[PDB]
Amino acid sequence: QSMVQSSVLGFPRIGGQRELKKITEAYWSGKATVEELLAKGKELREHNWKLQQKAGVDIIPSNDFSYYDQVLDLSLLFNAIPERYTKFDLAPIDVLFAMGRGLQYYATTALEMVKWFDSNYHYVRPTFSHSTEFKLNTAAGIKPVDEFNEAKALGVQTRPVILGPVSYLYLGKADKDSLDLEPISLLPKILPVYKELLQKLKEAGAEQVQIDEPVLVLDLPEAVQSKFKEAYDALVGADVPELILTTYFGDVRPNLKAIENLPVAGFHFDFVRVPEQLDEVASILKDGQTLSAGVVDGRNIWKTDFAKASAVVQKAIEKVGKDKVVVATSSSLLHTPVDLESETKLDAVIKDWFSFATQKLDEVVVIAKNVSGEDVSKQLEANAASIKARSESSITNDPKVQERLTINEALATRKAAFPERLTEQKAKYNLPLFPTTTIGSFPQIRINRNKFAKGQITAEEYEAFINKEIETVVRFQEEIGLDVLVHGEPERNDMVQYFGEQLNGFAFTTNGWVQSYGSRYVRPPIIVGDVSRPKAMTVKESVYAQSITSKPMKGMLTGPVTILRWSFPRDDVSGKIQALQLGLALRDEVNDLEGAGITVIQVDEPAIREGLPLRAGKERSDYLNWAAQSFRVATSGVENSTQIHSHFCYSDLDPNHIKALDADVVSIEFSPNYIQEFSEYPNHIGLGLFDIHSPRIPSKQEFVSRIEEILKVYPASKFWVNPDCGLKTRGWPEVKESLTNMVEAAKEFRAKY
Ligand SMILES: [Cl-]
Ligand SMILES: [Cl-]
Ligand SMILES: [Cl-]
Ligand SMILES: [Cl-]
Ligand SMILES: [Cl-]
Ligand SMILES: [Zn+2]
């Protein structure tokens, strides 16, 4: 324990080879027994605790492990279990899984999955009723207490991590039988349950608890933020551990007044995202409260600059004293891959710039020792050379050249306004009124794709297999009589990795898995440098699909903002600069598609709202502006007769931003008074006419009446006819009938003209 302690806010639990996914999925399909699942959990926790102890981390977390989601874990522990999950005599591990994955696997719905702030993790929404009885569920045991005791038996003193009451309630929602319930009003009922838990943790031997209150980086209603004082007045006492109120991902300053007189033992703040909040946040400390300074990024894969991170910490030190500063990860390392050392195919120069969760443990320790005065000179020197090698690999380290060298409006504008383009597109494609199309995906080829990865087939044979599947999908759309076709994207794994693995300025990993939801993990690409496009990324398969039909075939691309958001970004330049470079890369792909005869092109940005900055203000309004501008740069090089499409199904869509794209045609998921939101849409628009989830083939008449309802709002000149989203989750027969009814409905309308 150095004078200045080191701290980790959580550790990824998935395992270095995805052991957690393997044993959990095996348990669901009735392979693994309950004991084997629990033994694997125990073994992961032990390994991870020991890894952190061996690296020298002073404050090591417990309760950060989960078989599914830590928020779900708290719902189970506090008995926030809707009544429908208790009716099948399920063991507690199965109640957890039924809430997480859904009840249908136990019957004779899952809870809502929600983004965790602006990370790429998702949690299971706490759901509350007037009938909810909050109590400590000793049924299974008490997860925090049992896992604290497990670590202690191993000779590892840990700090339990729990999501705090205010955040837990605020992030939850009223169940359907209680739509009047304001979750925050439940605080008096849930606080005694937190108190009992905290008492039990003190009794087990915990000296300090990390109590996460991240909603403090959000714009909080007064009815919510005015409660921090009475919540923590109630929790703090001599019978519970010291409480470290922990925030991350943002700026708490706007909420400072709410937490300026809390009886807690100290705070944690994110000084990676918001280093500038230091002065103000430090000023609220009283009574020997401690400041945990988050300076090792828990959400990115870059070696930390030890000189710069040490200097931020040294400012904290100057402000509250060495005995009251802690060096910490900025957030849980849940959001980074487990271990860089399992990567064997990375360029050696680039691998030297990275640090994954396991390596971050060494980094916080190095920084804590640095400011404490210990000799880590060798590590500082190595680190200073890595940082320099990295800064020298981009066009300029200088922000003056960097700010100036990054979009003239011309680059972001088509050559003519839509009405003029429409005249040329009509003449080129001769589409009728109510033209029909689909969004992209069709029912699925699994084997052969894996065989080609395994080396069992050659590229030529894989190519022949891709081409037969494209052919089958194209011919099926022709038989149905759709007007604008898609190729089914059989060649693509994932709409981001497919691009991230081809673009310049990117690296990709073999094992760089991060948990996204439950047992579903992602392996995000990494932007390491200035981005450009080195080859034709999608042209081959599109040109093949277009060569077998006389109907127009959509090219299909992912837009720049979505590639950026589903990748690990550079931490040395703005997101804006990266999006614009990605925009210019995609512009070359679009221009190539067009040049190869693919003149109808869909460019999809499903991650927009996900990347929305957490507070209303300047960063948010800039984001929307540059987000749109990036899309326009990608799409504005084309001739007037080339038709740009874009599809939108991504939760709470912003029609103002959609309008800023100047896309020729948009499709919008749609199947109460919602049609009015897009009533002023300027170009062409296809409001989805059926729900690709709903379990029923809509009749022709059902299509006809839905088209009639839309025609009360839109002109027929603007209207495209298409489903809500892709069809890969349906069976072929339901897809044939649905789409056949859709086209026949369309034709009826054409005739009535
Ligand atoms: Cl159990
Ligand atoms: Cl705003
Ligand atoms: Cl407009
Ligand atoms: Cl009408
Ligand atoms: Cl029109
Ligand atoms: Zn969709």
Side-chain angles (χ1 to χ4, degrees), residues 131-134 136-175 177:
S131 71
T132 300
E133 177 182 358
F134 293 104
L136 271 191
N137 248 359
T138 58
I142 317 211
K143 191 190 165 288
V145 168
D146 302 328
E147 295 186 357
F148 180 88
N149 284 333
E150 226 176 63
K152 188 176 85 195
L154 290 173
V156 187
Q157 176 77 11
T158 65
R159 177 165 85 176
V161 181
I162 62 190
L163 183 61
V166 176
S167 292
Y168 174 76
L169 291 178
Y170 189 56
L171 294 178
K173 82 169 185 265
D175 211 349
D177 65 353

Side-chain angles (χ1 to χ4, degrees), residues 104 111 123 134 146 148 171 361 364 389 395 443 487 636 712:
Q104 63 271 26
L111 292 184
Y123 66 101
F134 293 104
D146 302 328
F148 180 88
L171 294 178
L361 308 176
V364 288
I395 292 327
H487 75 282
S636 287
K712 298 173 170 185

Side-chain angles (χ1 to χ4, degrees), residues 339-344 346-359:
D339 186 13
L340 182 53
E341 292 317 306
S342 71
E343 297 304 321
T344 59
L346 290 179
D347 176 0
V349 170
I350 292 148
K351 186 186 191 263
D352 190 57
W353 308 336
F354 296 164
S355 166
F356 299 175
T358 298
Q359 292 71 42

Side-chain angles (χ1 to χ4, degrees), residues 414 416-443 448 452-453 455-459 462-464 466-467 469-474 476-480:
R414 298 279 297 264
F418 178 71
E420 289 59 54
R421 314 194 297 259
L422 181 55
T423 299
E424 292 188 49
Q425 297 169 8
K426 282 171 168 182
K428 179 173 187 122
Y429 309 114
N430 304 283
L431 293 170
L433 286 178
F434 304 89
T436 54
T437 193
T438 66
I439 304 314
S441 69
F442 276 89
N448 298 93
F452 172 67
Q456 305 170 20
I457 59 181
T458 64
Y462 177 67
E463 187 195 302
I466 292 313
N467 288 354
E469 188 83 17
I470 289 169
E471 188 184 24
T472 293
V473 157
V474 168
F476 178 91
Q477 293 164 85
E478 290 185 298
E479 282 313 290
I480 286 154

Side-chain angles (χ1 to χ4, degrees), residues 551-608 610-618 620-649 653-655 657-672 677-679 681-689:
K551 294 180 173 170
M553 178 64 56
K554 292 179 179 177
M556 290 281 341
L557 302 179
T558 303
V561 180
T562 292
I563 297 174
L564 169 61
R565 287 304 306 184
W566 294 346
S567 292
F568 279 114
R570 291 171 70 180
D571 69 353
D572 66 316
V573 300
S574 62
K576 171 180 170 174
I577 288 173
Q578 293 172 83
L580 293 169
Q581 289 180 2
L582 279 161
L584 286 159
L586 289 169
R587 184 182 189 108
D588 293 341
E589 182 73 11
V590 166
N591 294 356
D592 267 1
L593 285 161
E594 177 184 60
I598 306 301
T599 68
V600 182
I601 303 155
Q602 189 163 300
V603 183
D604 289 340
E605 283 282 44
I608 295 301
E610 288 188 20
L612 199 73
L614 294 170
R615 289 196 184 273
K618 194 212 200 321
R620 182 171 293 175
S621 60
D622 293 349
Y623 170 83
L624 290 168
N625 283 339
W626 62 250
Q629 189 187 21
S630 295
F631 184 97
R632 294 200 305 280
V633 166
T635 55
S636 287
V638 298
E639 296 306 315
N640 293 333
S641 60
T642 290
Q643 204 174 68
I644 295 297
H645 292 226
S646 192
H647 170 60
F648 298 85
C649 67
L653 329 171
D654 177 3
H657 175 269
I658 294 177
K659 286 167 210 197
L661 306 186
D662 191 27
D664 295 300
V665 185
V666 295
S667 67
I668 305 288
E669 179 199 61
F670 175 72
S671 292
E677 207 120 48
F678 289 93
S679 49
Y681 187 84
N683 304 348
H684 286 187
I685 176 153
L687 296 184
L689 298 175

